Amino acid sequence: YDIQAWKKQCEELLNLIFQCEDSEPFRQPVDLLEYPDYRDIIDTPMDFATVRETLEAGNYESPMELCKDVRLIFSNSKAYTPSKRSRIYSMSLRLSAFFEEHISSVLSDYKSALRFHKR
Ligand SMILES: Cc1cc(C(=O)Nc2cnn(C)c2)no1
């Protein structure tokens, strides 16, 4: 029932994501010189360094907010892909499965801890 435990859990999950080769295209903002039309399709760019910096700045109140930003990395990849068989998008799908597998207990434990706090 530790209301604050999600933060270190998210830091460790981000460390695992950075060690994963599938995160390479998503570790820093999409390079607008390499993809000049990126902002014509994507309204809100997001990447794992921005997520880690937001967390470290104390700018996430809950793991649900971090999860919304991580999911935005994957939805941006899906929206920008010219094909469902593209390399970067295919890496996003595996990384998304890995993230969802690991974030599930972080969200469950936090929501349970908050319910206990407000019992
Ligand atoms: C670090 C880092 C950022 C990128 C980058 O532009 N990645 C990216 C994501 N989607 N598209 C179309 C490109 N590569 O390495």
C-alpha 15: how far from chain center? 12
Which ligand 1 atom sits closest to the C-alpha of 38?
Answer: 12
Range(s) of the domain holding residue 8: 1-119
| Residue type at 112 in one-letter notation | S
Q: SS3 for 27? A: coil
From the CA of 32, how far away is ligand 1's center (Å)?
9
Total residue length of the chain:
119
* DSSP per-residue letters across 42-78: -SS---HHHHHHHHHTT--SSHHHHHHHHHHHHHHHH
From the CA of 95, how far away is ligand 1's center (Å)?
14
Q: What is the resolution of this structure in A?
A: 1.2
Domain total in the chain: 1
CA distances 90 to 78, 97, 106, Å, are 9, 11, 25
Q: How many CB atoms neighbour CB 4 within 10 A?
A: 9
Rounded CA-CA distance 92/20 in Å is 11
Burial degree of 31 (CB within 10 A; 0-12, 13-18, 19+)? exposed
31 lines ligand 1 (CB under 6 A): yes
Sign, CA dihedral 24-73-32-87, equals: positive
CA distances 28 to 9, 18, 32, 91, 109, Å, are 21, 11, 12, 15, 29
Q: SS3 for 101? A: helix
What CATH code is carried by the domain that includes residue 111?
Answer: 1.20.920.10
